[PDB]
Amino acid sequence: QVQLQESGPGLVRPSETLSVTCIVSGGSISNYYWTWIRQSPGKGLEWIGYISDRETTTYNPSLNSRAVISRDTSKNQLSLQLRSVTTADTAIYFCATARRGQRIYGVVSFGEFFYYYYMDVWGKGTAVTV
Amino acid sequence: IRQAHCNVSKATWNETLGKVVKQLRKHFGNNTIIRFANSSGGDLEVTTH
Amino acid sequence: YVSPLSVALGETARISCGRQALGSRAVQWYQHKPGQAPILLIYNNQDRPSGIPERFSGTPDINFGTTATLTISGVEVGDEADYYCHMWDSRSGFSWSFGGATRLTVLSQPKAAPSVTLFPPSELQANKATLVCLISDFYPGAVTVAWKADSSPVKAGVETTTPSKQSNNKYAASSYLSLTPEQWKSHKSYSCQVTHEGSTVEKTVAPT
Ligand SMILES: *[C@@H]1O[C@H](CO)[C@@H](O[C@@H]2O[C@H](CO)[C@@H](O[C@@H]3O[C@H](CO[C@H]4O[C@H](CO[C@H]5O[C@H](CO)[C@@H](O)[C@H](O)[C@@H]5O[C@H]5O[C@H](CO)[C@@H](O)[C@H](O)[C@@H]5O)[C@@H](O)[C@H](O[C@H]5O[C@H](CO)[C@@H](O)[C@H](O)[C@@H]5O)[C@@H]4O)[C@@H](O)[C@H](O[C@H]4O[C@H](CO)[C@@H](O)[C@H](O)[C@@H]4O[C@H]4O[C@H](CO)[C@@H](O)[C@H](O)[C@@H]4O[C@H]4O[C@H](CO)[C@@H](O)[C@H](O)[C@@H]4O)[C@@H]3O)[C@H](O)[C@H]2NC(C)=O)[C@H](O)[C@H]1NC(C)=O
Ligand SMILES: *[C@@H]1O[C@H](CO)[C@@H](O[C@@H]2O[C@H](CO)[C@@H](O)[C@H](O)[C@H]2NC(C)=O)[C@H](O)[C@H]1NC(C)=O
Ligand SMILES: *[C@@H]1O[C@H](CO)[C@@H](O)[C@H](O)[C@H]1NC(C)=O
């Protein structure tokens, strides 16, 4: 029921602020989690970061020093800024919605559980070249 | 890797605590109120089961 | 990187997942075609989203010790794509990288004779010429392109792309021969030869 549409500049100069936007037409942006993945050529696709429904961010430790993800409230859109991009940040960026499931193997009070995430709905993908 | 722990049924413990306090009241009075708390301190073998 | 797997048409396949878990797991199985939108096949080891056919399945960890294998019954041509195995367990932390890409290949497909078409330069008004040789609807995607000026080979200015799959599950490729208009009008005719397996197809075109 959710359609995702990516929109990016495609080309960014080195050492700048790469900015991409993901437009959602299905539902509200404050109900499900959202995340960014990049398929780089010659490599496996990389998960870079995500943003929750409660507006809290998490980033990949390799790119946590350079990435930031934002969510618009009036517009049904989510933006991703990447500061100081280099020749290695060229990839096909896919925005994807995500669901938080928790897997429990013991007693709830003791802890012994962990949160796992899965991206059911993806976008078509926007290519970004540096 | 989990945590070692011990269970006890809650209702049976409540009932046995009640029958303990009913006899405790035989040497301190029916009206005096008594309570139960954990250990006050000391060595490890004293403050724990 | 990517690791290959080869399966026969119609038989059941069991894709093995690397970096197997150390504790209780809720794995994810993703099917990714090159360049398209990736689509997950499994989000919870047994559970699948609405719309996924029953052919794909994942192993639940009913007893600690089972490995995550993606089992596919009745493999068809459309299943040929990369497969990523996202691994989540209790003993490990946040798994950022997905599993190693698994290049599934579907063997024993029906081979197709290459459909070849040669186009002479249009562009001559712009003082440039590019002979364009296109190959469509052939399998397997392994072809060789040779250019011929009358009878002598060209071997210069040739730019050829690697075969890429199309919607027919066959392959498509293109070759460009860049030449000056004077050299195009010089030689009598130009022949593009496409060699597919043991067969060879030659197409000849000449200036008017
Ligand atoms: C001393 O006191 C202690 C405390 O009082 C006490 O501690 C207890 O210890 C035991 C074990 O030592 C603990 O038991 C464990 O319980 C775990 C949790 O189980 C509960 O939750 C699941 C999952 O619920 C989700 O899914 C259902 C649908 O399936 C939804 O309806 C739920 O709402 C929920 O999903 C939503 O919510 C999630 C969280 O928000 C979201 O993420 C999600 O997206 C959804 O939104 C239920 O299924 C369980 O129900 C079962 O149990 C009830 C009784 O409670 C029965 O009626 C019936 O049998 C139900 O089936 C339950 O409610 C278990 O996960 C755990 O067992 C798994 O882990 C072990 C260890 O790794 C595995 O070896 C084992 O095989 C189990 O794996 C199965 O489940 C996982 C999870 O999906 C699968 O991935 C896996 O493949 C396998 O599935 C297979 O079996 C399924 C059926 O079981 C089958 O359907 C599948 O198809 C597949 O074949 C373990 O049993 C217990 O929690 C502790 N107590 C407390 C309070 O925590 C101790 O025992 C006492 N005694 C002592 C110490 O001596
Ligand atoms: C402690 O464990 C024992 C056995 O592991 C539990 O006793 C069993 O209780 C069930 C009730 O569901 C009976 O059907 C079994 O016959 C009992 N076993 C025996 C050996 O008597 C007991 O309930 C557990 N107590 C707690 C507090 O967890
Ligand atoms: C406390 O209650 C008991 C009833 O079991 C009664 O016999 C006893 O006299 C009471 N003691 C006082 C001080 O009221």
Q: Where are the domains of chain C?
A: 1-108, 109-208
CATH class label, C109-208: mainly beta
Long-range contacts of A113-117 (CB under 8 A, 24+ apart): A113/C90, A114/C88, A114/C89, A114/C90, A116/C26, A116/C88, A117/A33, A117/A35, A117/A50, A117/C88
Q: Which amino acid is at C208?
A: T
In terms of C-beta density within 10 A (0-12 exposed, 13-18 middle, 19 or more buried), how is residue B37 classed?
A: exposed
Q: What is the chain B residue with the closest CA to A112?
A: B2
Q: Both tokens of residue A50? A: 């995500």
Considering only CA atoms, which of C148, C137, C136, C152 is closest in space to residue C205? C148
Q: How far apart are CA C60 and CA C173, in angstroms?
A: 43
State the Cα torsion C33-C162-A41-C8 to the nearest 10°.
Answer: 40
> How many Cβ atoms are within 10 Å of C136's Cβ, its own excluded?
16
- Reading phi first (left if > 0) and then psi (alpha if -120 to 50, else beta), residue C137 is in left
Residue with tokens 């990049």: A38
Sign of CA dihedral C168, A126, C132, C200: negative
For residues C34 and A43, the answer to whether their CB atoms sit within 8 Å is no
Considering only CA atoms, which of C47, C75, C72 is closest in space to residue C60? C47
The technique by which this structure was obtained is: X-ray
Under an 8 A CB cutoff, do C37 and A103 touch? no
Of A110, A113, A114, which to mutate for an interface test with B (greatest number of B Cβ within 10 Å)? Answer: A110
How far, rounded to the nearest angstrom, does the alpha carbon of residue A6 sit from its chain's CA centroid? 12
Strands C101-106 and C82-86: antiparallel
DSSP states of A17-49: EEEEEEEE-SS-TTSSEEEEEEE-TTS--EEEE
Option in C25, C26, C96 nearest A101 (CB): C26
Which residues approach ligand 3 with their CB closer than 6 A? B 29-30
For residues A37 and A46, the answer to whether their CB atoms sit within 8 Å is yes
Q: How far apart are CA C18 and CA C37, in angstroms?
A: 23
The data reach a resolution, in angstroms, of 5.8
CA B12 to ligand 2 center in whole angstroms: 14
Q: What angle is formed at CA C154 by the lines to CA C151 and CA C155, rounded to 5 degrees?
A: 135
Cis peptide before C140 (omega within 30 of 0): yes
User: In CATH terms, are C1-108 and C109-208 the same topology?
Assistant: yes
State the Cα torsion C90-C93-C94-C95 to the nearest 10°.
Answer: -80
Domain C1-108 has CATH 2.60.40.10: yes
